[PDB]
């Protein structure tokens, strides 16, 4: 009872159709993640990715930062998250500039306009997510 078969019935492609690669759970989770979800605009993809990453980026800096044992621990963590997000979106912009040099299609992550929209969504979402995480950690007594 074989469970590892050729990828898309192609023995000569460098891949295997394992349970990890091809199972229904993997397909569902991957295809429903924002980067692969159907119908989402590049702005919406970038926005979702941005809030998801900016929400959790604050935590390492807040807990394990140099000023963890200081009254300004959370503020310093938020500023660190903002700086890291600035670096991340600068990386995104230069990546778009290097990769999608000539393009006129748009509405596609592999085009200049689409990648710019994705980066804009990522920046706004990450800033908002870091701010929301700051608010939650300030009001941690609620939970």
């Amino acid at each position: 009872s074989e469970f590892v078969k050729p990828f898309n019935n192609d023995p000569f492609v460098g891949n295997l159709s394992t349970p990890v690669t091809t199972s229904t759970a993997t397909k569902l989770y991957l295809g429903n993640l924002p980067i692969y979800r159907k119908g989402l605009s590049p702005l919406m993809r970038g926005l979702e990715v941005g809030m998801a990453h900016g929400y959790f980026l604050i935590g390492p800096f807040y807990i394990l930062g140099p000023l963890r044992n200081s009254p300004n621990a959370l503020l310093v963590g938020l500023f660190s998250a903002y700086g890291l997000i600035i670096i991340l979106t600068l990386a995104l912009t230069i990546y778009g500039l290097a990769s999608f040099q000539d393009n006129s299609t748009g509405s596609n992550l592999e085009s200049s306009k689409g990648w710019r929209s994705f980066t804009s969504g990522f920046t706004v979402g990450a800033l908002g997510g870091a701010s929301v995480a700051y608010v939650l950690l300030n009001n941690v007594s609620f939970f």
Partner: protein
């Protein structure tokens, strides 16, 4: 049917092929034209599979070569026993083991080297030994030198017998491949016959000769008044006076009243308070139980009678959905190829040597070996090094099997084929594991160094700033400490005192003590894991990509060891599985060096030392591991720089030999870098200039000199590197431990 079939007089006994050096190899049989012929002779000396094509002849050669190796090993055991008999202070040490330093080597006075005959006590001058053979013989019950002399003579007789057997089984009566391929009968005889009867005979020896002599010695009887073993063997009255259960005879054995032998067959555990070692009654019970286990195990496989298993069917029955045909074909592979068997056996031998190292220090088996700190360190380090070497040999011979004896016809769709078909995924995932593990583990050390240098101890990964506690190791230690009451009710004490319990001490020195784990232990263990993982990455990549790769689709055609495939494709340097082994030997060297350094520092800081009457525990280095092992600076300062004093300050004393070997090992390690960094083209051009200089005086040799091959240069560099490193650590550890302990 399993039967004996041999060929009579398959080879003639003559010196003509002694005179003809390269007789074995087709290419070398012609004669020398360059100095590379000389190197190729030694390189291809024992490559029987390349020399011939008959598996029968290869098996016969291997069998008689094993006989020669056994002869050498018997000569080595003879040297140990004879030097103990003749050139040693074993009698004085037996009379007073704690005070007398064991020594069994004496140097002649020629160039002032007689200073090496240091003061070892007992009115004897010689070189202190660290092999533990004295404690071994004390456990065995040898109390006089005539016994050592006679067992040495017996070992010489056995070595001569092994040489004769090796001659006989190649030149007079050589077996057949059908005889060799009886793996089921071989396993039956090695389980029940070799291991089972070996354990049974050793248990009998212990029960009859070792328990009485050792018990009397621990009581206080000096060796002169000890009854001789031949007296103890049959004198049941004396054995009953010592162990009362012996008066009941063998009826409590034949009837199943085995509890009657509880006195001399115990389950006490722990360490004997007198000798600070394992109970010999426990050892005898252990070996007897193992003899029963192995004799039971050895009746599994089929032979001339109907009963029994077959490994072919056992393998072929084990197949799953995610493995296709499963283990089909592996029986044929392991019956036809010697290299696959060599790989598996070397891997297990090396891992077993490492396990031996880990067990012997924690549970000192021989009397007065725990207090003999040089012996413990020496044995642990030695067996760790042997284990690493054997594991890399396992990888190398697996690669050799892949290159030579692999064939898809027999392995279509079995586990070997399925592993080759996703080697890329395997190696990429192990690569990620290596990067993650190394980054985190070494970045802990680098972060700690940076914080200490910046004057921020509160930001360290220390036991009091940011704790990385080994919760699972501590939990396992707690379980093993509570085991003798709850989960091992018949055991009175723990298996080892390292997990916890009392502090066993003989005289002042501490034999064993609980080993506490903390942040430094967490860091160094994850460093061990990272090093092992990178070594496995290199070796496994070499084995998997032995056939071919994305860079060279026809790597198998070139061979097992070949220099390269030219500067094309950007450079195909060290693409061979041989070169992968060459790179992995550096990495196991790094791994084992870090392991032995961890062992040495941890034991000198936290176990070894002296305990006073009031209970004050004073360690060799003073428990500095827990706070100084957190940084590479602390490793450099408090371990290397601090403990190199006993080596560098050794001149003019008995350890001056250790100082000289320290410097010489450093020299050889540095010398190796010439071969490791340089290349053959430079040396060939330099040799051309020198050959011109010789031709000018009309003495250029007929055998034209050549620079060493690329593979040979790599091998020479690796060999010198390993020799220099291991010698440096050898001299350093021996000088330090002999001086302080």
């Amino acid at each position: 049917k399993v039967r004996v079939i041999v060929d009579k007089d398959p080879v003639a006994t003559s010196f003509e092929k002694w005179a003809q050096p390269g007789h074995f190899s087709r290419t070398l049989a012609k004669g020398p034209k360059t100095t590379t012929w000389i190197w190729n002779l030694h390189a291809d000396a024992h490559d029987f599979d390349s020399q011939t094509s008959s598996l029968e002849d290869i098996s016969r050669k291997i069998f008689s070569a094993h006989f020669g190796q056994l002869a050498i090993i018997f000569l080595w055991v003879s040297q140990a026993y004879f030097h103990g008999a003749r050139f040693s202070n074993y009698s004085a040490w037996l009379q007073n083991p704690t005070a007398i330093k064991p020594s069994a080597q004496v140097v002649w006075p020629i160039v002032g080297q007689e200073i090496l005959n240091g003061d070892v006590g007992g009115g004897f001058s010689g070189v202190q030994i660290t092999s533990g053979v004295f404690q071994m013989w004390r456990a065995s019950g040898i109390t006089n030198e005539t016994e050592l002399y006679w067992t040495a003579m017996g070992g010489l007789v056995m070595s001569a017998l092994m040489v004769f057997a090796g001659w006989f089984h190649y030149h007079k009566a050589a077996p057949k491949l059908e005889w060799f391929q009886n793996v089921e009968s071989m396993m039956n005889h090695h389980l029940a016959g070799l291991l089972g009867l070996g354990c049974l005979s050793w248990s009998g020896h212990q029960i009859h000769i070792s328990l009485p002599i050792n018990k009397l010695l621990d009581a206080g009887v000096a060796p002169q008044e000890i009854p001789l073993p031949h007296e103890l063997l049959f004198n049941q009255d004396l054995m009953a006076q010592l162990y009362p259960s012996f008066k009941k005879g063998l009826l409590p054995f034949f009837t199943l009243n085995w509890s009657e032998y509880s006195d001399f067959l115990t389950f006490k555990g722990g360490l004997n308070p007198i000798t600070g070692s394992l109970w010999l009654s426990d050892t005898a019970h252990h070996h007897l139980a193992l003899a029963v286990l192995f004799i039971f195990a050895g009746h599994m496989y089929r032979t001339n009678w109907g009963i029994g298993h077959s490994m072919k069917e056992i393998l072929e029955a084990h197949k799953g959905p995610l493995t296709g045909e499963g283990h089909k074909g592996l029986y044929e592979i392991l019956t036809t190829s010697w290299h696959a068997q060599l790989a598996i056996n070397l891997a297990m031998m090396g891992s077993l040597s490492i396990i031996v190292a880990h067990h012997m220090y924690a549970m000192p088996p021989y009397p007065y070996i725990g207090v003999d700190y040089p012996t413990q360190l020496s044995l642990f380090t030695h067996h760790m090094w042997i284990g690493g070497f054997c594991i890399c040999g396992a990888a190398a011979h697996g690669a050799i099997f892949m290159v030579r004896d692999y064939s898809p016809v027999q392995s279509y769709n079995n586990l070997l084929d399925r592993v080759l078909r996703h080697r890329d995924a395997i190696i990429s995932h192990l690569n990620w594991v290596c990067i993650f593990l190394g980054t985190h583990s070494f970045g802990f050390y680098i972060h700690n160094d940076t914080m200490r240098a910046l004057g921020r101890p509160q930001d360290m990964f220390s036991d009091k700033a940011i704790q990385l506690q080994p919760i699972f190791a501590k939990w396992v230690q707690s379980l093993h400490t509570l085991a003798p009451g709850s989960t091992a009710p018949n055991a009175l004490a723990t298996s080892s005192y390292a997990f916890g319990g009392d502090v066993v001490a003989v005289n002042g020195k501490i034999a064993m003590m609980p080993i506490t784990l903390g942040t430094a232990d967490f860091m160094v263990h994850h460093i061990h894991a990272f090093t092992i993982h990178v070594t496995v990455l290199i070796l496994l990549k070499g084995v998997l990509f032995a056939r071919s790769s994305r860079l060279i689709p026809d790597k198998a055609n070139l061979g097992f060891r070949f220099p390269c495939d030219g500067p094309g494709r950007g450079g195909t340097c060290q693409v061979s599985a041989w070169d992968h082994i060459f790179l992995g030997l550096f990495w196991m060297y790094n791994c084992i060096s870090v392991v032995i350094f961890h062992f040495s520092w941890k034991m000198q800081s936290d176990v070894w030392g002296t305990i006073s009457s009031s209970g004050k525990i004073s360690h060799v280095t003073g428990g500095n591991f827990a706070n100084s092992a957190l940084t590479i600076n602390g490793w450099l300062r408090d371990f290397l720089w601090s403990q190199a004093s006993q080596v560098i300050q050794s001149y003019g004393s008995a350890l001056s030999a250790y100082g000289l070997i320290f410097l010489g090992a450093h020299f050889i390690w540095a010398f190796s870098l010439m071969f490791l960094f340089s290349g053959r083209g430079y040396w060939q051009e330099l040799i051309e200039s020198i050959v011109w200089a010789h031709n000018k005086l009309k003495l250029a040799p007929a055998i034209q000199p050549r620079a060493l091959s690329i593979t040979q240069g790599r091998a020479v560099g690796l060999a010198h590197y390993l020799l220099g490193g291991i010698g440096t650590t050898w001299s350093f550890f021996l000088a330090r431990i002999i001086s302080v302990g």
